[PDB]
Design a protein around this nucleic acid. Structure first.
Ligand code: NA
Ligand code: NA
Ligand code: NA
Ligand SMILES: [Zn+2]
Ligand SMILES: [Zn+2]
Ligand SMILES: [Zn+2]
Ligand SMILES: [Zn+2]
Lengths: 189, 189
DNA sequence: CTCGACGTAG
DNA sequence: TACGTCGAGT
């Protein structure tokens, strides 16, 4: 019935694995499967009766439920925050569920740190040079600026362009991943 | 009358500065201004008769002309590539004009390098781990993947997630700016 | 709720 | 033409 490479959810609790955790079948033994539960990267032996096959292509945009890209638990659409709109007018939700976004968002910029950054804000319509990408721009006209902050401490960093800020987040604001980017680029340079 | 911090365009060719180049007024005397032309970062003394005031807030989205974020020349809207759609259904163009995009895009992935990459493409619906961000995903379900390539050589790099690929571009695929990101983050550790 | 920006997909 | 994704602004 189940085949290698098929996707399943846990029907019930399986040790550390909560219900609705998505796994992929990695081996089959009679009516038991070795399942890689993707969120925790845990390979477990599971009886077929404890698993429910799912169709990954009937999840996400256009469907009732969506698989989170961090925890890889199948959740209702409302477990994800609306974030954008496509050309066809449909709403797009973040790929990470509200629970996983708590850890990505971390500590908010404090009120005193915000006021402090606001007192040195580049004026709208001024000529700005971003301290990261070094691009010159006209504030609010040829680039939009943001209050960047450290989400471990809640304290301010600098005024930077939105492009750079949304780049930092792709790499988790973490020098570990930036160093990985450098060695990746250098490898093919 | 022209005031410091006002914006102007060059009416005519001014040495290295082409017409319609945007500049900011940095000093004024009775007949001329010191103008910083933003694209080339060139500060010149220009007679008032060779400058025209420009309302920077009547450029870009919703208007017939737009100021490029690299060259900072005022161009027709059609000099910029349509790239996205907002929630109100209006089209958004790239901030960089078609001419400036040539340098950003560089050399395309060659046919032969593309075929090499396609030979080792992760299957749709497989479990993938991005070599940069180290995030696990289900291909085409919880993350979309791309052919990354070096745009100086046209040679392939690796299959990576779209999030990482679009992060590389924010930092110009250039270790210089990635090292700047690292120093910036460490400063506010 | 909304946003622009990136290199991709096609 | 179009796409999702990021930390933001609103
Ligand atoms: Na930030
Ligand atoms: Na306006
Ligand atoms: Na790339
Ligand atoms: Zn989650
Ligand atoms: Zn920047
Ligand atoms: Zn340009
Ligand atoms: Zn990645």
């Amino acid at each position: 019935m189940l085949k290698n490479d098929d996707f399943v959810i846990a029907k019930n609790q399986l040790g550390n694995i909560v219900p609705n955790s998505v796994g992929v079948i990695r081996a089959v033994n009679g009516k038991s499967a070795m399942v890689l539960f993707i969120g925790l990267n845990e390979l477990k032996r599971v009886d077929f009766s404890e698993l429910e096959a799912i169709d990954i292509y009937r999840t996400g945009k256009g469907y009732d439920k969506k698989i989170c890209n961090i925890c890889h638990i199948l959740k209702n659409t409302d477990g994800f925050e609306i974030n954008q709109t496509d050309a066809k007018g449909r709403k797009t939700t973040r790929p990470s569920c509200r629970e996983c976004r708590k850890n990505i968002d971390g500590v908010k910029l404090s009120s005193t740190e915000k006021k402090k950054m606001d007192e040195i804000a580049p004026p709208k319509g001024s000529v700005f040079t971003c301290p990261i990408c070094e691009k010159r721009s006209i504030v609010g006209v040829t680039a939009n600026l943001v209050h960047d902050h450290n989400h471990d401490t809640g304290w301010g960093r600098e005024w930077i362009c939105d492009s750079c800020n949304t780049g930092l987040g792709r790499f988790k604001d973490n020098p570990k991943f930036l160093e990985k980017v450098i060695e990746y680029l250098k490898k093919y340079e």
